[PDB]
Design an enzyme around this catalytic site. Structure first.
Site, mmCIF file in Angstrom:
data_model
loop_
_atom_site.group_PDB
_atom_site.id
_atom_site.type_symbol
_atom_site.label_atom_id
_atom_site.label_comp_id
_atom_site.label_asym_id
_atom_site.label_seq_id
_atom_site.Cartn_x
_atom_site.Cartn_y
_atom_site.Cartn_z
ATOM 1 N N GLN C 240 7.565 3.262 -0.971
ATOM 2 C CA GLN C 240 6.952 2.863 -2.270
ATOM 3 C C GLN C 240 5.361 4.036 -2.630
ATOM 4 O OE1 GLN C 240 4.276 -0.566 -3.683
ATOM 5 N NE2 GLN C 240 6.644 -0.946 -3.798
ATOM 6 N N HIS C 242 3.393 4.241 -4.960
ATOM 7 C CA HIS C 242 2.384 3.612 -6.372
ATOM 8 C C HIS C 242 2.234 4.263 -7.120
ATOM 9 C CE1 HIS C 242 -1.083 0.902 -8.114
ATOM 10 N NE2 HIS C 242 -0.884 0.598 -6.964
ATOM 11 N N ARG C 286 7.681 -1.827 -9.171
ATOM 12 C CA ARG C 286 6.915 -0.384 -9.065
ATOM 13 C C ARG C 286 7.579 0.792 -9.118
ATOM 14 N NH1 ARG C 286 2.219 -2.055 -5.298
ATOM 15 N NH2 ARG C 286 0.185 -2.731 -6.411
ATOM 16 N N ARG C 399 8.774 -3.149 -3.128
ATOM 17 C CA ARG C 399 7.186 -4.198 -2.091
ATOM 18 C C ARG C 399 6.900 -4.870 -3.885
ATOM 19 N NH1 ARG C 399 2.255 -4.704 -1.856
ATOM 20 N NH2 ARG C 399 1.328 -2.725 -1.264
HETATM 21 C C1 LIG Z 1 -3.573 2.504 1.640
HETATM 22 C C2 LIG Z 1 -3.839 0.728 0.372
HETATM 23 C C3 LIG Z 1 -3.090 0.232 0.574
HETATM 24 C C4 LIG Z 1 -2.933 -1.188 -0.329
HETATM 25 C C5 LIG Z 1 -4.263 -1.103 -1.268
HETATM 26 C C6 LIG Z 1 -4.851 -0.196 -1.444
HETATM 27 C C7 LIG Z 1 -4.969 0.718 -0.285
HETATM 28 C C8 LIG Z 1 -5.619 1.993 -0.361
HETATM 29 N N1 LIG Z 1 -4.289 -2.515 -1.453
HETATM 30 C C9 LIG Z 1 -3.632 -4.005 -1.655
HETATM 31 C C10 LIG Z 1 -3.630 -5.156 -2.684
HETATM 32 O O1 LIG Z 1 -4.447 -5.040 -3.476
HETATM 33 N N2 LIG Z 1 -2.639 -5.473 -2.096
HETATM 34 C C11 LIG Z 1 -1.918 -5.875 -1.642
HETATM 35 O O2 LIG Z 1 -0.566 -6.722 -1.217
HETATM 36 N N3 LIG Z 1 -1.081 -4.470 -0.502
HETATM 37 C C12 LIG Z 1 -2.747 -3.653 -1.067
HETATM 38 N N4 LIG Z 1 -2.119 -2.985 -0.289
HETATM 39 C C13 LIG Z 1 -0.842 -3.110 1.037
HETATM 40 C C14 LIG Z 1 -1.897 -3.815 2.144
HETATM 41 O O3 LIG Z 1 -3.575 -3.336 2.261
HETATM 42 C C15 LIG Z 1 -1.763 -3.110 3.364
HETATM 43 O O4 LIG Z 1 0.006 -3.278 4.090
HETATM 44 C C16 LIG Z 1 -2.446 -3.643 4.635
HETATM 45 O O5 LIG Z 1 -3.735 -3.163 4.465
HETATM 46 C C17 LIG Z 1 -0.923 -3.962 5.521
HETATM 47 O O6 LIG Z 1 -2.246 -4.279 7.148
HETATM 48 P P1 LIG Z 1 -1.615 -4.092 8.144
HETATM 49 O O7 LIG Z 1 -2.567 -5.168 8.626
HETATM 50 O O8 LIG Z 1 -0.622 -4.452 8.514
HETATM 51 O O9 LIG Z 1 -2.550 -2.091 8.562
HETATM 52 P P2 LIG Z 1 -4.354 -2.454 8.222
HETATM 53 O O10 LIG Z 1 -4.649 -2.551 7.687
HETATM 54 O O11 LIG Z 1 -3.374 -0.437 7.971
HETATM 55 O O12 LIG Z 1 -4.691 -2.109 10.327
HETATM 56 C C18 LIG Z 1 -4.274 -1.342 11.680
HETATM 57 C C19 LIG Z 1 -4.812 -1.234 12.405
HETATM 58 O O13 LIG Z 1 -3.911 -0.843 13.937
HETATM 59 C C20 LIG Z 1 -5.073 0.079 14.129
HETATM 60 N N5 LIG Z 1 -4.046 1.053 15.189
HETATM 61 C C21 LIG Z 1 -3.407 1.596 14.331
HETATM 62 N N6 LIG Z 1 -2.802 2.829 15.192
HETATM 63 C C22 LIG Z 1 -3.419 1.932 16.925
HETATM 64 C C23 LIG Z 1 -2.883 2.861 17.805
HETATM 65 N N7 LIG Z 1 -2.027 4.014 18.165
HETATM 66 N N8 LIG Z 1 -3.427 1.645 19.346
HETATM 67 C C24 LIG Z 1 -4.685 1.121 18.464
HETATM 68 N N9 LIG Z 1 -4.742 0.769 17.284
HETATM 69 C C25 LIG Z 1 -3.979 1.671 16.223
HETATM 70 C C26 LIG Z 1 -5.497 0.175 13.467
HETATM 71 O O14 LIG Z 1 -7.068 0.764 14.598
HETATM 72 C C27 LIG Z 1 -5.923 -0.712 12.452
HETATM 73 O O15 LIG Z 1 -7.315 -1.442 12.914
HETATM 74 O O1 LIG Z 2 -2.889 -1.858 -6.482
HETATM 75 C C1 LIG Z 2 -3.609 -2.161 -6.189
HETATM 76 O O2 LIG Z 2 -4.507 -2.640 -6.929
HETATM 77 C C2 LIG Z 2 -2.202 -2.511 -4.991
HETATM 78 O O3 LIG Z 2 -1.779 -1.191 -4.612
HETATM 79 C C3 LIG Z 2 -1.619 -4.011 -4.442
HETATM 80 C C4 LIG Z 2 -0.402 -3.613 -3.799
HETATM 81 O O4 LIG Z 2 0.335 -4.706 -3.809
HETATM 82 O O5 LIG Z 2 -0.639 -2.803 -2.945
#
Ligand SMILES: *Cc1cc2c(cc1C)nc1c(=O)[nH]c(=O)nc-1n2C[C@H](O)[C@H](O)[C@H](O)COP(=O)(O)OP(=O)(O)OC[C@H]1O[C@@H](n2cnc3c(N)ncnc32)[C@H](O)[C@@H]1O
Ligand SMILES: O=C([O-])[C@H](O)C=C([O-])O
Ligand code: HEM
Ligand code: SF4
Ligand code: F3S
Ligand code: FES
Ligand code: NA
Lengths: 105, 238, 588, 121
Positions: C240, C242, C286, C399
């Site tokens: 996706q 954005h 999107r 999404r």
């Molecule tokens: C990029 C983004 C996405 C986003 C958003 C704004 C941004 C800048 N705003 C959103 C919103 O308002 N509403 C919504 O529905 N989605 C939005 N998105 C998407 C969403 O935030 C993300 O997809 C969501 O955060 C997914 O969460 P998830 O728990 O699946 O992933 P994460 O938050 O990044 O956490 C990853 C964790 O894993 C650990 N990690 C990664 N690799 C390792 C390894 N190698 N070993 C140990 N730990 C690992 C990281 O440390 C982290 O804790």
């Molecule tokens: O536009 C946002 O605030 C954010 O990017 C929303 C999703 O769903 O990922």
């Protein structure tokens, strides 16, 4: 506890401020500093009381203050206790010596 | 156009004590970058340079550094705001905390004091709401200025009182958080919380120095928050 | 055993939204649980989320979870599994109200209830009038959400192994996953985390591109690990973009900008979204908004300036008061990275790589799936996935805004709610042998031994460049077949790449190199998949096959890692509480 | 065992911070000052001739300087303490702007009193 300290410090400070206003008052309006005008100001009940009141204030205000300084900078327990002893004894001396000086004039 | 840096280095397996080190970066004259950009580039030239970073947009709190003597985030401090004729840009770890390696500090005590003020809602379950707790825009506004904190540690590590008693004084960061639950209308343990902050160190080591306010990359104001906590403490124990 | 062993009932790899929710839930269901994370938990990408959580709370207007289920299925372009989407939408409201009771500082309607804003792809009555069902705390919702879950993990005394980097899964001689090896970043120690349940929760991989909204840490570590363990990934071609990332910076501005009434203008000042999507306009799906903006640019109707080619997103007409209260976060982001004040002037935006629809195929329970030689699903014992790393699939080929956070909470929670039954169902697992654990360290041993090889810096830049030009918003047969060739070459270079920091105390080079291997495996499967799907659907857009083809492609694509070949999987079209929504033509 | 960065020389201190380290210093000085002041007072009241001697002790330039400093420290402690207490009662705002502005107004009021103390000597 700490609330208590906070309040005591600030209460004593209000008393001491008035006392400084009082003493600054006399000084900046008495020109010629004769032994006579001096001892008469310091023989007055009002001057005697306010000064002992102020000394007690310093006993409390300065002790809290110094304790804070010490517990920021002096880590080893033994040394800090010693310094607090010196400081408190000094402060009590101040009030006692005040009592010897003014209840003697 | 050239940029020069003096950067803190330490590696316990190699270095006797910590040391500064000069770095040069051929930087694009026309464009302006961020310190984090520079840092990242320096690492292609010197792979052994360790520093934390993640969101690169000032939201995550990863990269707090002392830059030209003042704390901030690398990802949102522009090179233009540090660079001065005939001086190196000086970069060193947040002050007061154990140095793990190069620019990476041990945030342990920072978090430990955070945990100490019990940073979670405490609601005794009485009069449960039908769905969400109801909170009026009026009440919700009281969290504005408090919940936005990113736990970057800029403020606490720039506070003298925190330096001297990093485990008795809660710290600007911590107390900001404490207030965030003290005035949350959904929290019912206000009294219980305040009885835990009534001693001589938790809140009262704060002397209104105001370093906390000036360094906060999210422009929050721990000084004020702390002030509100003192009020509550007098209201309750005096 | 010559490596320390730490045993738990569950090892959750990742402390993001989905990881923290699952940990929290596993823990409260009596089992022991280790929570690993390569950053301190509140620095996970989740913190950066802005818009909010999409969910039928029915606060701003009477809503209905089926309406939401509709929008999602249609949004997914009909390859979202409909049973899962139904579970998600139906469970949502209750699962979100839970967060509010955890103290999440949501914004508020006048009467006291949680604020919901309009957002892309939201309609009442199954395609009717524009809805407003995205719950938010200003435009810092992710920040609010993550910290609340952290706090709740504190209250709840979860074991958190902060700043450990997971290297690779460990498989027993029966082929079941029995934990993972992981490198402690601070000290360099390497440990085997032994578990009956290993829950991957590592988030996305936008960093396979040259420009992304993702944190530096989103390197698809989960995808790498799954592939290397012989576990298939699904719908990887679905990336996706954005519509509105800040031009030249890649930092995201929320879709909440258009939800609150902003709109897109081109160089001619025309509001081009009314032409491209007559009904929903600037709140279309999107993938559609993303292509619209690219068409405008690609025929010289975009703007230029310091930021480069872009579309203008106009907000000024909403007023200082509304902007500072509802969208303060993007106010700062725009002033910082665009040097543009949105109160006075439009924000230069361009579609930016944002979210990974693909991932590890799972059941609603979280259990990861693989297929046998006959094409049938079988559960991978001891392996689970939740969050962005997963492909449940609730998002299919596009999404909806606000649906990701909902996903995290619903399926994280669900993974924990069902972990005990999943463990009994899979039976006791045989022990990992000492050479089983050894194998997991193969990848790390390589880097530690390679001093004289290739520069990994160069390799990474080549990789992102390749994905940017050949697998961006629009794709073609030639581009993708060439892209893929370059990747094979890049991937060879990597097998000979060198680690220049030998040290063991907080050595970030070693981590970023290990991360690079994962960028590779991910980028690679995305390429093989995008070549494979000969149609256009949701985000995936091919000039040479411009049509959606429901006869041949109404299904999931699956990358088989051992044969490096592709295959398909059925899309689920049997919900439980209402009848399926049949695939029809999808326009906004 | 681990090193920390606390090299005070490498850190920016704003005016509000300086104001405060001075306030602590001025308090510690004033504590020692009271004992010195008391001894002087005791001399000037014990007899007509003790006072004459106290008048003589005040004549020394070296003493006049020490005395002025003592009085400048007290002036500073008092003024800045009132500033502190005024924040404590909500009379002074707790923004970083208003902090700097009150700190400076404190320094000016202190210089003014420091001169009046000089004259009075
Ligand atoms: C990029 C983004 C996405 C986003 C958003 C704004 C941004 C800048 N705003 C959103 C919103 O308002 N509403 C919504 O529905 N989605 C939005 N998105 C998407 C969403 O935030 C993300 O997809 C969501 O955060 C997914 O969460 P998830 O728990 O699946 O992933 P994460 O938050 O990044 O956490 C990853 C964790 O894993 C650990 N990690 C990664 N690799 C390792 C390894 N190698 N070993 C140990 N730990 C690992 C990281 O440390 C982290 O804790
Ligand atoms: O536009 C946002 O605030 C954010 O990017 C929303 C999703 O769903 O990922
Ligand atoms: C004249 C005898 C005095 C002595 C010996 C004295 C000494 C001290 C000391 C040692 C401290 C500790 C400073 C610190 O905690 O850093 C202190 C604090 C303080 N002093 Fe005084 N002081 C005196 C008079 C006054 C007066 C007249 C005021 C009027 C306001 C005052 C105001 C304060 C305040 C408000 C504090 C605490 C502020 C803080 O904790 O940061 N003092 N004093
Ligand atoms: S209050 Fe501000 S400076 Fe302090 S931890 Fe939070 S973001 Fe950092
Ligand atoms: S910077 Fe420190 S002293 Fe108090 S007002 Fe501040 S926490
Ligand atoms: S990188 Fe996250 S704030 Fe600096
Ligand atoms: Na996914």
């Amino acid at each position: 506890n700490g609330v208590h300290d906070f309040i005591l410090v600030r209460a004593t400070a209000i008393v001491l401020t008035l006392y400084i206003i009082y003493m600054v008052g006399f000084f900046a309006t008495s020109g010629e500093l004769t032994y006579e005008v001096w001892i008469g100001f310091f023989a007055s009940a009002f001057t005697k009381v306010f000064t002992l009141l102020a000394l007690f204030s310093i006993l409390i205000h300065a002790w809290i203050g110094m304790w804070q300084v010490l517990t920021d900078y002096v880590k080893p327990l033994a040394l800090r206790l010693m310094l607090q002893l010196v400081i408190v004894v000094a402060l009590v001396v101040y009030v006692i010596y005040g009592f010897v000086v003014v209840w003697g004039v | 156009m050239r940029l020069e840096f003096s950067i803190y280095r330490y590696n316990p397996d190699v270095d006797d004590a910590p040391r500064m080190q000069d770095y040069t970066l051929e930087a694009d004259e026309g464009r302006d970058m961020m310190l984090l950009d520079a840092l990242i580039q320096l690492k292609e030239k010197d792979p052994s340079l360790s520093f934390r970073r993640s969101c690169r947009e000032g939201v995550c709190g990863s990269d707090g550094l002392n830059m030209n003597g003042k704390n901030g985030l690398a990802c949102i401090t522009p090179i233009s705001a540090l660079n001065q004729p005939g001086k190196k840009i000086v970069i060193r770890p947040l002050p007061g905390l154990p140095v793990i390696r190069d620019l990476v500090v041990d945030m342990g005590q920072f978090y430990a004091q955070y945990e100490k003020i019990k940073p979670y809602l405490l609601n005794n379950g009485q009069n449960p709401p039908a769905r969400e707790h109801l909170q009026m825009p009026e009440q919700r506004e009281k969290l504005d200025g408090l919940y936005e904190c990113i736990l970057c540690a800029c403020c606490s590590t720039s506070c003298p009182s925190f330096w001297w008693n990093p485990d008795k004084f809660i710290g600007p960061a911590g107390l900001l958080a404490a207030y965030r639950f003290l005035i949350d209308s959904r929290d019912t343990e206000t009294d219980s919380r305040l009885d835990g902050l009534s001693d001589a160190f938790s809140v009262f080591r704060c002397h209104s120095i105001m370093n906390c306010v000036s360094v906060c990359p999210k422009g929050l104001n721990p000084t004020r928050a702390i002030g509100h906590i003192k009020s509550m403490l007098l209201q309750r124990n005096a | 055993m010559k490596l320390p062993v730490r045993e738990f009932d569950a090892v959750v790899i990742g402390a993001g939204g989905a990881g923290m929710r699952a940990a929290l839930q596993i823990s409260q269901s009596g089992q022991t649980c280790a929570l690993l994370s390569k950053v301190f938990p509140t620095r996970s990408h989740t913190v950066s989320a802005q818009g909010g959580i999409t969910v039928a709370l029915g606060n701003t207007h009477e809503d209905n979870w089926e309406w939401h289920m509709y929008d999602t299925v249609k949004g997914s372009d009909y390859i979202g599994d409909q049973d899962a989407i139904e579970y998600m939408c139906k469970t949502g409201p209750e699962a979100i109200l839970e967060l509010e009771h955890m103290g999440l500082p949501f914004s508020r309607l006048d009467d006291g209830r949680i604020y919901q804003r309009p957002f892309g792809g939201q309609s009442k009555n199954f395609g009717g009038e524009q809805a407003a069902r995205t719950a938010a705390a200003a435009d810092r919702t992710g920040h609010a959400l993550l910290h609340t879950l952290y706090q709740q993990n504190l209250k709840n005394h979860t074991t958190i192994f902060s700043e450990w980097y997971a290297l690779d899964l460990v498989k027993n001689q029966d082929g079941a996953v029995v934990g993972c090896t992981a490198l402690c970043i601070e000290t360099g120690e390497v440990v085997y985390f032994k578990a009956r349940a290993t829950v991957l929760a590592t988030g996305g991989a936008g960093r396979i591109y040259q420009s992304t909204t993702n944190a530096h840490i989103n390197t698809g570590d989960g995808v790498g690990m799954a592939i290397r363990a012989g576990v298939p990934v699904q719908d990887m071609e679905m990336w996706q973009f954005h519509p509105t990332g800040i031009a030249g910076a890649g930092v995201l501005v929320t879709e909440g900008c258009r939800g609150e009434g902003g709109y897109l203008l081109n160089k001619h000042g025309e509001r081009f979204m009314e032409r491209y999507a007559p009904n929903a306009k600037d709140l279309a799906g999107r993938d559609v908004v993303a292509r619209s903006i690219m068409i405008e640019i690609r025929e010289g109707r975009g703007c230029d300036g310091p930021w480069g080619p872009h579309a203008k997103l106009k907000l000024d007409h909403l007023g200082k008061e509304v902007l500072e209260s509802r969208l303060p976060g993007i106010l700062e982001l725009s002033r910082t990275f665009a040097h543009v004040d949105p109160v006075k002037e439009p924000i230069p935006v361009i579609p930016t790589c944002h979210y990974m629809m693909g991932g590890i195929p799972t059941k609603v329970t979280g259990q990861a799936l693989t297929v046998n030689e006959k094409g049938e699903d079988v559960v991978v014992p001891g392996l689970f996935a939740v969050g962005e790393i997963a492909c449940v699939s609730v998002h299919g080929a596009n999404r909806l805004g606000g649906n990701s956070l909902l996903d995290l909470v619903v399926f994280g929670r669900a993974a924990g709610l069902h972990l005990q039954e999943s463990i009994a169902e899979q039976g006791a697992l045989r022990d990992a042998s000492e050479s089983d654990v050894e194998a997991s360290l193969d990848r790390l041993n390589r880097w530690n031994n390679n001093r004289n090889g290739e520069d990994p810096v160069a390799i990474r830049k080549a990789l992102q460049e390749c994905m940017q030009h050949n697998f961006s918003v629009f794709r073609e047969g030639d581009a993708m077949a060439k892209g893929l060739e370059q990747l094979k070459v890049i991937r060879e270079r990597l097998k000979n790449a060198r680690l220049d920091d030998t040290s063991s105390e907080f050595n970030t080079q070693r981590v970023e190199c290990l991360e690079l291997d994962n960028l590779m495996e991910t980028a690679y499967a995305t390429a093989v998949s995008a070549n494979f799907r000969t149609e256009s659907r949701g985000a995936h857009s091919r000039f040479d096959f411009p049509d959606r083809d429901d006869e041949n492609w109404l299904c999931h694509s699956l990358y088989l890692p051992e044969s490096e070949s592709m295959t398909r999987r059925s899309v689920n079209m049997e919900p439980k509480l209402r009848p399926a929504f049949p695939p029809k033509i999808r326009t906004y | 065992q681990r090193p920390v960065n606390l090299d005070l020389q490498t850190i920016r201190f704003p005016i509000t911070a300086i104001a405060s380290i001075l306030h602590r210093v001025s308090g510690v000085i004033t504590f020692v000052a009271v004992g010195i002041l008391l001894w002087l007072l005791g001399t000037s009241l014990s007899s007509p001739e003790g006072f004459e001697q106290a008048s003589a002790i005040m004549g020394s330039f070296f003493v006049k300087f020490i005395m002025w400093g003592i009085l400048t420290a007290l002036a500073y402690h008092v003024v800045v303490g009132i500033r502190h207490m005024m924040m404590d009662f909500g009379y002074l705002e707790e923004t970083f702007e208003a902090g700097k502005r009150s700190a400076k107004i404190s320094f000016v009021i202190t210089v003014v009193l420091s001169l009046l103390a000089g004259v009075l000597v």
